[PDB]
Amino acid sequence: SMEQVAMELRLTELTRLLRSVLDQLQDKDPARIFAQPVSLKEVPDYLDHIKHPMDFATMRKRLEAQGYKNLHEFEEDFDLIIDNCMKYNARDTVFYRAAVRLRDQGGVVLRQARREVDSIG
Numbered sequence: 001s002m003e004q005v006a007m008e009l010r011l012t013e014l015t016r017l018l019r020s021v022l023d024q025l026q027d028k029d030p031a032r033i034f035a036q037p038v039s040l041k042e043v044p045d046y047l048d049h050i051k052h053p054m055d056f057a058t059m060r061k062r063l064e065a066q067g068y069k070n071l072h073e074f075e076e077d078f079d080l081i082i083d084n085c086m087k088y089n090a091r092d093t094v095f096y097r098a099a100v101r102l103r104d105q106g107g108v109v110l111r112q113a114r115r116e117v118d119s120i121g
């Protein structure tokens, strides 16, 4: 149906916007602390601590399968990246501090992305 097609064109345009949002968010992580999943080989206890791991590569895989239906879903995953890190790592660490910075800087990007997703529909 043409209705189905038009919904698919909306999903695709959301996907394009979310890709640019994701690149912008990831530039706020020049150290690449959040680039890849935490390794269970190097933090073998990780999953006793953190129930839903997230990272930018996993977000990117989901994005390219057009797996985000809206901005809310994408933001939930970005938030898990931050929130996971701030629980596992202590306040005095380079990891926790990189999370705080990503959060603060990412908040600006997401503020306007929310207006672009509303605005362009």
Ligand code: NA
Pocket (backbone or CB within 6 Å): 086, 087, 088, 089, 090
């Ligand atoms: Na903690």
